[PDB]
Design a protein around this ligand. Structure first.
Ligand SMILES: *[C@@H]1O[C@H](CO)[C@@H](O[C@@H]2O[C@H](CO)[C@@H](OC3O[C@H](CO[C@H]4O[C@H](CO[C@H]5O[C@H](CO)[C@@H](O)[C@H](O)[C@@H]5O)[C@@H](O)[C@H](O[C@H]5O[C@H](CO)[C@@H](O)[C@H](O)[C@@H]5O[C@H]5O[C@H](CO)[C@@H](O)[C@H](O)[C@@H]5O)[C@@H]4O)[C@@H](O)[C@H](O[C@H]4O[C@H](CO)[C@@H](O)[C@H](O)[C@@H]4O[C@H]4O[C@H](CO)[C@@H](O)[C@H](O)[C@@H]4O[C@H]4O[C@H](CO)[C@@H](O)[C@H](O)[C@@H]4O)[C@@H]3O)[C@H](O)[C@H]2NC(C)=O)[C@H](O)[C@H]1NC(C)=O
Ligand SMILES: *[C@@H]1O[C@H](CO)[C@@H](O[C@H]2O[C@H](CO)[C@@H](O[C@H]3O[C@H](CO)[C@@H](O)[C@H](O)[C@@H]3O)[C@H](O)[C@H]2NC(C)=O)[C@H](O)[C@H]1NC(C)=O
Ligand SMILES: *[C@@H]1O[C@H](CO)[C@@H](O[C@H]2O[C@H](CO)[C@@H](O)[C@H](O)[C@H]2NC(C)=O)[C@H](O)[C@H]1NC(C)=O
Ligand SMILES: *[C@@H]1O[C@H](CO)[C@@H](O[C@H]2O[C@H](CO)[C@@H](O)[C@H](O)[C@H]2NC(C)=O)[C@H](O)[C@H]1NC(C)=O
Ligand SMILES: *[C@@H]1O[C@H](CO)[C@@H](O)[C@H](O)[C@H]1NC(C)=O
Ligand SMILES: *[C@@H]1O[C@H](CO)[C@@H](O)[C@H](O)[C@H]1NC(C)=O
Ligand SMILES: *[C@@H]1O[C@H](CO)[C@@H](O)[C@H](O)[C@H]1NC(C)=O
Length: 485
């Protein structure tokens, strides 16, 4: 009773049943369940082992809150090819061929119709006889949206928060919301430094380049674009923020760039400190607070001051060659990027557009790594090597244009979510950010980050988030009640 774990026999290839099944881990809770015929909330963590995600079964998360508000069960399902839910122990271009969006979608619908639940083994709790609500954020949010688009008729309702539904090759706009959200002074100074790094990369002497690398403690990094590629570590911490993280790693970064200590009486205004100070501060912040134990955290290395993990040009690096399901880099997600292909390459902005990341960090810098991760094996290669591209995925899914004709799907996006401009509220989406309708609601959380509505800590910290949560819960509750009308 109440909680449990089990294995579901998921179809390897939904288009060829006869190729067989594999074991896929899921967890359940009936804590708020009303009994046979009551609703069910389904959620996958997405691109990660499900270990330590048990919280999504409780009302400390939005999934548990939905369940509580509609008297439903809650099921956490581990995504295929992660954790204990991989059909193969070795992951290369051949074995990864069944890690595709299409498969992942049909997993969800097939599971909802097919699973034999321990808590109700009469089919009264399956999707045929009870309203299932699929919820997700980030990639899992996209999978949720993509399912409503590609495979409607199983789930009663869908909620996708921070969903990158549009595949984008040169996703320089990853950084644009960070640039909008950051302090004026930090934004300006980080920009200065990023542009200076471009300048030295292109038009500097060998000594100037060696010296610049020394400032960051990266004298030993061979390729100048590998060095440039570490600078985004600053802006990347924006993605770790929510409304309950306070003076987080990100805000420490900005303070370091501006050159002040936490709680300083005297701070610079919006003008900032300028290049000379900013560069010094940025380099020292990285050298002293980020570099130590950075490579060691991958497990493949152990020296505190190692720079081995920064080498994107070494084809033998364990980052590329570790084919195991438990690999440290999440090559499973890299597969989706190179194969589907999503790409989502996080780049410096085009000439003529202000950037907070060096232009030397380019789409090409990332695309070069795909064949290192996935060398041709038995004639099998990554999709984008056979000229599959962004348009390939978008034609089929609809991308951010799947919004034309939707049924009981609600969206949430964050004002300053790095993933915003790959989703329906992108400032760069043709027709503009998607206009909310009663049929297809979209809310943008003011000052929001990535999936800021999933954590109930954010509900209590922030009025904006509470507002948004109340609305979307009420919307799911109204839609769910309609099922029984
Ligand atoms: C120019 O450059 C400046 C330098 O970089 C730059 O400055 C800083 O700006 C950033 C951006 O806002 C500041 O960020 C944050 O800081 C907030 C915390 O502040 C206090 O604490 C820090 C750190 O110190 C302490 O803690 C450490 C250990 O953790 C100790 O070692 C230490 O002893 C301290 O206790 C400190 O730096 C701050 O200091 C200043 O402000 C105090 C007043 O509070 C002054 O006394 C002091 O002199 C400092 O100020 C001076 O600078 C300001 C300008 O910033 C001048 O006006 C002033 O005259 C002085 O010169 C504070 O002591 C932190 O809460 C912020 O985070 C919140 O928001 C983010 C973003 O949304 C959320 O992700 C996060 O979860 C958190 O959210 C919550 O609060 C929101 C309300 O803002 C709310 O919407 C949200 O829901 C959530 O709230 C709820 O939770 C709260 C608890 O977390 C709760 O209170 C609330 O009720 C809700 O429950 C953010 O991290 C950064 O601190 C500044 N750094 C400085 C000044 O040193 C400046 O902005 C740039 N300017 C321009 C124009 O570009
Ligand atoms: C920026 O990054 C550098 C590495 O790229 C850091 O360095 C060095 O770090 C330590 C600390 O100085 C040196 O080590 C020694 O530490 C022990 C401490 O007891 C000594 O007993 C012994 O002499 C060690 O050799 C490293 O050797 C040195 N590494 C390299 C490759 O130079 C540097 O500290 C860092 N700068 C900042 C400000 O953090
Ligand atoms: C979140 O869920 C918990 C656990 O179900 C809720 O907790 C408790 O509150 C119930 C309703 O008031 C009580 O009847 C239970 O005795 C109590 N359970 C436990 C284990 O402490 C909690 O209220 C929910 N949070 C909100 C804001 O509704
Ligand atoms: C490229 O990566 C490989 C694999 O990690 C590096 O390999 C090796 O070098 C280490 C550093 O001395 C040795 O300690 C390892 O035993 C060794 N491992 C293997 C599998 O060869 C290699 O040095 C890297 N090459 C460059 C030029 O950096
Ligand atoms: C369903 O569960 C009940 C629980 O007691 C069990 O007795 C019954 O045999 C189960 N039926 C089937 C068909 O598995
Ligand atoms: C480097 O030099 C070229 C040619 O003078 C110039 O047009 C360009 O702006 C410089 N590039 C960078 C990145 O600063
Ligand atoms: C929208 O889709 C529904 C369900 O597939 C369909 O029945 C309806 O006719 C469509 N409407 C439009 C305007 O395309």
């Amino acid at each position: 009773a109440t909680t449990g774990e089990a294995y579901f026999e998921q179809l390897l290839d939904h288009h060829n049943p006869e190729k067989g099944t594999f074991s896929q881990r899921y967890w359940w809770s009936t804590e708020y369940w009303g009994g046979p015929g009551s609703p069910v909330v389904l959620f996958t963590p997405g691109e990660v082992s499900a270990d330590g995600y048990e919280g999504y079964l409780t009302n400390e998360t939005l999934t548990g809150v939905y369940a509580q508000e509609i008297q439903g069960a809650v099921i956490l399902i581990e995504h295929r090819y992660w954790g204990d839910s991989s059909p193969y122990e070795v992951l290369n271009a051949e074995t990864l061929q069944y890690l595709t969006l299409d498969q992942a979608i049909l997993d969800m619908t097939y599971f909802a119709e097919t699973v034999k639940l321990q808590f109700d083994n009469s089919t009264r709790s399956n999707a045929q006889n009870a309203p299932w609500v699929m919820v997700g954020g980030s990639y899992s949010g996209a999978l949720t949206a993509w399912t409503e688009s590609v495979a409607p008729g199983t789930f009663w309702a869908y909620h996708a928060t921070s969903a990158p539904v549009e595949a984008i090759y040169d996703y320089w706009q990853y950084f644009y919301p960070i640039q909008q959200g950051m302090a004026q002074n930090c934004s300006k100074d980080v920009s200065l430094v990023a542009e200076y790094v471009d300048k030295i990369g292109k038009n500097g002497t060998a000594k100037e380049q060696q010296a610049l690398k020394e400032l960051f403690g990266l004298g030993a990094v061979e390729h100048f674009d590998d060095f440039a590629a570490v600078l985004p570590n600053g802006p990347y911490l924006w993605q770790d923020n929510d409304f309950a993280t306070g003076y987080s790693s990100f805000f420490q970064f900005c303070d370091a760039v501006e050159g002040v200590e936490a709680g300083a009486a005297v701070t610079p205004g919006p003008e900032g400190v300028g290049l000379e100070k900013a560069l010094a501060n940025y380099a020292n912040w990285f050298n002293s607070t980020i570099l130590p134990d950075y490579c060691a955290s991958y497990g493949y290395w152990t020296d505190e001051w190692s720079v081995a993990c920064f080498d994107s040009y070494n084809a033998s690096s364990p980052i590329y060659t570790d084919t195991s399901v438990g690999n440290a880099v999440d090559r499973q997600w890299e597969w989706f990027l190179c194969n589907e292909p999503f790409f989502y390459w996080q780049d410096g902005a085009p000439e003529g557009t202000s950037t907070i990341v060096p232009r030397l960090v380019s789409a090409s810098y990332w695309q070069r790594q795909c064949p290192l991760y996935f060398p041709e094996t038995n004639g099998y290669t990554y999709g984008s090597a056979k000229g599959k591209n962004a348009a390939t995925v978008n034609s089929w899914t609809g991308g951010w244009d799947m919004t034309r004709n939707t049924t009981r799907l609600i969206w949430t996006n964050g004002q300053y979510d790095p993933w915003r401009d790959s989703g329906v509220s992108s400032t760069f989406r043709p027709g503009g950010p998607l206009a909310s309708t009663a049929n297809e609601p979209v809310q943008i959380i003011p000052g929001g980050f990535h999936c800021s509505d999933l954590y109930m800590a954010d509900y209590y910290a922030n009025e904006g988030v509470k507002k948004v949560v109340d609305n979307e819960v009420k919307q799911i509750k109204e839609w769910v009640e309609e099922y029984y009308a």
